[PDB]
Amino acid sequence: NEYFWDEPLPIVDAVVSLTGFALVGGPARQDHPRAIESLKKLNRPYMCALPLVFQHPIQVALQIAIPELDGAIEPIIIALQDRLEAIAQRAMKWANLRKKPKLDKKVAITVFSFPPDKGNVGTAAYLDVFGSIYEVMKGLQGNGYDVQDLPGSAKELMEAVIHDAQAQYNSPELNIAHRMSVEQYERLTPYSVRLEENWGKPPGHLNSDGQNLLIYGKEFGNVFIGVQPTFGYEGDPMRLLFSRSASPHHGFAAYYTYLNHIWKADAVLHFGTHGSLEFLIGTIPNLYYYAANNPSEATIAKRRGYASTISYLTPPAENAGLYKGLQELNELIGSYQTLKIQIVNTIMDQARICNLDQDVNLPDINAEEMDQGQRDTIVGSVYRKLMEIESRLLPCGLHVIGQPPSAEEAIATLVNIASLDREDEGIWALPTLIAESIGRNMEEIYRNSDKGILADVELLQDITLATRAAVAALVQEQINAPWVKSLCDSGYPNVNEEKLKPLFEYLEFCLEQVCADNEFGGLLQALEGEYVLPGPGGDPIRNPNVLPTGKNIHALDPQSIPTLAAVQSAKVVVDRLLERQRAENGGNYPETIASVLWGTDNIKTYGESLAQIMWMVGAKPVPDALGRVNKIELVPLEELGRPRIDVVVNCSGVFRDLFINQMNLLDQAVKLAAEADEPLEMNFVRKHALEQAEEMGIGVREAATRIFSNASGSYSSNVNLAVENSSWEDESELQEMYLKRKSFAFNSDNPGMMDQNRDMFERALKTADATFQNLDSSEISLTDVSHYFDSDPTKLISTLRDDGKAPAAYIADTTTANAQVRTLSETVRLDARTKLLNPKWYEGMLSHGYEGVRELSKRLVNTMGWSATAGAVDNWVYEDANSTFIKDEEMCKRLMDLNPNSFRRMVSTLLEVNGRGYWETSDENLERLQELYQEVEDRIE
């Protein structure tokens, strides 16, 4: 504030901090609001470079996360030259964004994976790519940028970049923006030779032509829309399991050479659609439009692509609703009521027609020989499953950047915001208040609703409807510029009105942030060489501070989790998991549970899934005076009330990158448990560790190695790549690759040395009785991305176990106040019923056209992944998918015309699940699919 100023004006174009600290520290606890306030006034690009660079993976992980909270850009990832030059050149280029006139600025925008063929599908971006690019182009043009020949629409935009994309008359072909020669190539890219190990001498099959390298895209004045069809690539990850290493082909390198040394872009804009499978961009300022609900992958981009990650809202979430057979059943259950035998028999019949017999226990007994309760609980349990399907809050569509939701299409998002207690802000959820007004506990209703008690299942729905109508009253009254009258009109007149006040005062504030249009504003500020406001990810419902969007989003201080609320919520989930495991399998406790840790959900819940694993082993985090969680301790068996349970923990590469300090804590806890002087029947960790130590000839502590991940620099088991390329022969191949890639053991007694320990990995996995993951959210669910099944060891454990027994598979959901520990199959069915097979969902997607079909195949490809890793997909899922999308001749034609490439993917996927034995169906269906594959093959090729 003193030396960077002179009404005074800034005398600096860009700031590079070399301290490695927060802008505003102290003794202790960084002050980010006062740093943000200062950096906003100065309004310059703020870059930070840790002094560690100019010379303990835990120390690095803790340090690097702090400047990110200040909104810092990272100009860096034996001599000083490369580091000094890297920081200097990027600081200059960032500074040049101010010194350069607006009409001379050249903004490049690269698109990934168009047309959407094979390779990795990427992340759950929920992005209308070309629809968003078009809005960006017009926004730039209408602000003073030289955008020449701006097309008439988004459809016209894609047509300009992808000639005949819909394959009507000629085959789809990408617009060639430039043809650089081998001479020009090798001259401008010094690292060309290092790529010749896998691709040989340029050009080489990829991006040819045959003499020149092809730079796909199209120029529109000072704005260039480019296309990177393939990274170089996914394409059979089995080719890289040995001597061969990964390297992008010449075409991929040639693209960024064009932007750096020929078109000379001043700024590049990417979209967070392919996440961690994206890592040559150079010294040019690198912008990303990342989803607000994906902080974890946004920070990887910050640390691997020197990126500034501007956020966009995911589409306005809607209740999934009920449809077809599910609707008829809802109506059947609806009465009852006034009809109160024969109906219960038909309710059970339609429930079996909807295949709900595998979600709720439906005996072969007739209703005539049941009690009053036996009939009440049957219809009550079927009903609660229907309401779970109907009330699932998920996006049904794609988002266009700069196009915020209306007040109307934000009520559903708002009702769930109102359905969560918040001690500070100091308000209670609407349902709890409504429940309190009639002398009830909202969680007692939840617990009873889970048991299938009709009186409580109906009461839940009534309170839900009362909540789902009251919030809409506040929204409607906001539109024309009342919610208490709605509560009375719903039947709850004794609601604490004192507490109703700050609640709706909060909800109205949230409404403005949901509908705020700051997304394009963030891009401008970045391009103008200004300072973009930093904000937190990721889940708006659980944390409305993620709103509004258009900010440079970040993750959190890895020493701030788990919170006390997180560890308490974790015990509940664990107790629920164990209860469900004892029943239907015991009732003995499992001796070992295999879990996966994702960074994403731990950011959103402040360490819940992390805290679950601590509790399984009987350990607790110990915050210091400053509130930093950097210690851990065992809890006495008296407090645990059950045996310590052994764990096998699969940490994602991303989790390892962001939270290696937590991996350190976990490994400490597990080893403490194994050393505990406790009876073996009370300590399954020690029970196993002792046995393993003898058989391996090592010490107990070393035998207690349970915390694993990818090797440093690596991400995923590559199972997702193999599934997306259909490049594997049998399940043993996938599992072999899993054991090779995921068996790198973390050591809290030697943190820097993460060595492979496949022997320990297998011995630990052999003892697993259960498999466990936490659901991130409804938007990022089991079929929305491929990472879940990628880390899934379910079938692997079957082949490892001597008894060949398949472990029980569970998925925890804490995205609402009603925490559920579902089985894997139950969750897969929930995804199928609410997304792929749901008219409300697929029609919403298809209403965006070309990119809508891509979303369909994505959900279907990931479903196939679950068949390969766990076999958790019921046959009716594929059969119904084939019904609505392929047997329907009208829908089949609509799909093939909208998007030949994505339709081709749906066909082959259905063809594949049958070919491998996951889908049994009539030959008439297989013959039709086999033909449709040829019809679309010809259109494209």
């Binding site: 003794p27 301790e633 065992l634 809890v635 006495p636 403490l672 050393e675 505990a676």
Partner: protein, 287 residues
């Protein structure tokens, strides 16, 4: 009972990889299992984070001393630091002094916390022993007596006695970081002085009998009046109150023996004391 108290089967903690670091060897014999686990946690943490120092820790509970006793004598012989606390068993105690006394000169330091007087006589920190001195309540008794001793000693010997008081306060704290500072303080001052082993506000209020600094008068006086070791005369608002000004650096270094003696002398005379410090050179701010 193991059901209500978490106990460990591990007596020995070794560094995974020595590397280019110096090795500190510590032997403890203790009664409380909590300090066993806290010491171990402190040692394992230092081994995994410190880039110039590694610690080997071997320990036994007093009853375990018969196979173990043979290793005990050998561990003591190679030890830099010897620690003992709450040792109250006649033949057991005698076995301890027999094993320590030969190497009492070899040990860089020998720290015995409230035990049988026979064991207490093993205490040796630099020039300070159980000479020169003129369950939880027993530790407070000895702790509060230490400042009263400082004045009768020369400066260099006073600081040794203060370091003893300091390591005693860390021990009573019992936290993992308390014991880490305990070991690192003992190492830097008596074992590896040339290793350069090296939260404090810019200015504040300090009292030797308080482990935390105070950043305002209110918090300090609140703490002052709750002290059970002082006469009610000191808490009287009409009591003589003397302010002391000192450099923060001597507090963060631990070389504050004469400051501690100054505070004790004033209090002994019936004066309430307010010691301010600053890291800067404008001492008008704390004033």
């Amino acid at each position: 009972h193991m059901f209500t108290n978490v106990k460990s089967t591990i007596r020995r903690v070794d560094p995974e990889a020595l590397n280019g670091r110096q090795l500190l060897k510590v032997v403890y014999v203790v009664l409380e299992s909590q300090y066993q686990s806290a010491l171990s946690a402190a040692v394992r943490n230092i081994n995994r984070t410190n880039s110039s120092l590694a610690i080997q820790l071997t320990g036994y509970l007093i009853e375990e001393l018969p196979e173990n006793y043979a290793n005990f004598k050998h561990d003591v012989s190679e030890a830099n630091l010897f620690i003992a606390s709450l040792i109250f068993i006649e033949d057991l105690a005698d076995k301890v002094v027999e094993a320590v006394t030969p190497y009492r000169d070899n040990l860089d330091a020998a720290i015995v916390f409230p035990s049988m007087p026979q064991v207490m006589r093993l205490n040796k920190m630099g020039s300070f022993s159980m000479a020169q001195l003129g369950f939880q309540d027993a530790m407070l008794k000895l702790l509060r007596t230490l400042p009263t001793v400082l004045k009768y000693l020369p400066v260099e010997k006073a600081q040794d006695a203060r370091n003893f008081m300091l390591s005693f306060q860390y021990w009573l704290g019992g936290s993992q970081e308390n014991l880490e500072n305990f070991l690192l303080m003992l190492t830097d001052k008596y074992v590896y002085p040339d290793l350069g082993l090296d939260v404090y506000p810019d200015m504040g209020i300090w009292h030797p009998l308080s482990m935390q600094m105070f950043e305002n008068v209110k918090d300090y006086l609140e703490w002052y009046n709750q002290r059970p070791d002082i006469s009610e005369d000191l808490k009287d608002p009409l009591a003589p109150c003397i302010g002391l000004i000192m450099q923060r650096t001597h507090l963060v270094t631990g070389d504050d023996a004469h400051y501690v003696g100054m505070v004790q002398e004033l209090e002994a005379m019936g004066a309430r004391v307010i010691c301010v410090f600053s890291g800067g050179l404008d001492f008008s701010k704390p004033v």
